Design a protein around this ligand. Structure first.
Ligand SMILES: C[C@]12CCC(=O)C=C1CC[C@@H]1[C@@H]2CC[C@]2(C)C(=O)CC[C@@H]12
Ligand SMILES: C[C@]12CCC(=O)C=C1CC[C@@H]1[C@@H]2CC[C@]2(C)C(=O)CC[C@@H]12
Lengths: 124, 124
């Protein structure tokens, strides 16, 4: 495990969200990883629980893009990106910062997504 | 405490680094805050230890700028920014992502700065 590997994991994650490739997203994660995403709310913990969370993330097709270089050090990575979707004619762009901690095996053991209302950008 | 307060704290932090205003930086932090900055290395814990760390950060004058909107939710904030300095004729720009957790009193209880070698940008 290396910054190069962690950076590549972030890019595979972003591409798999764009693709709607749940096997691909879930495969990045350790068997006992947790995911906490949408506040400082309740973390989901199984392989099964993580898949189900992304299943739901992906109802609408997402356009996902890294908007700066990945920061990768030690066993963690942080990244700024946008998630864009369209619903009943309105485009929304969400701009989180996610954080990944890695396993010694190179797997994501935890992901936390930070964004608040000011990071949801949408017209009427 | 609110996303608006946390966001303002990030901006006061950035301005105080630019100013070289150690009282101003240190005042953002709880009496028992920790700061971990430069890897996944050893966290500094006192008021005194935090001041001493910033004293050292600030030998060279720093030009500091937020490069995207702050993400503020729950009791945490994350932000992407750059720290620029000049030494023996060479300009370096460092591009971290920092993370702050807040106290119920609105004080920073912890700061973690994530950046690796790929986030240090410098010519010869
Ligand atoms: C989960 C997600 C993508 C995966 C990721 O890693 C970070 C985010 C944050 C924005 C989410 C988005 C999924 C779709 C969501 C739930 C909406 O309908 C509004 C907020 C938005
Ligand atoms: C500590 C710092 C500013 C405070 C902050 O919040 C984040 C950083 C990361 C880059 C540091 C910089 C201080 C000066 C440093 C130590 C150098 O001489 C090369 C790396 C650079």
């Amino acid at each position: 495990n290396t910054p190069e590997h962690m950076t590549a994991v972030v890019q595979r994650y972003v591409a798999a969200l764009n693709a709607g490739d749940l096997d691909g997203i879930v495969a990045l994660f350790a068997d006992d990883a947790t995911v906490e995403n949408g506040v400082g709310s309740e973390p989901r913990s199984g392989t099964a629980a993580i898949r189900e969370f992304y299943a739901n993330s992906l109802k609408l097709p997402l356009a996902v893009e890294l908007t700066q270089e990945v920061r990768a050090v030690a066993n963690e990575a942080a990244f700024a990106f946008t998630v864009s979707f369209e619903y009943q004619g309105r485009k929304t762009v969400v701009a989180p910062i996610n954080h990944f901690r890695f396993n010694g095996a190179g797997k994501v053991v935890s992901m936390r997504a930070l964004f608040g209302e000011k990071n949801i950008h949408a017209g009427a």
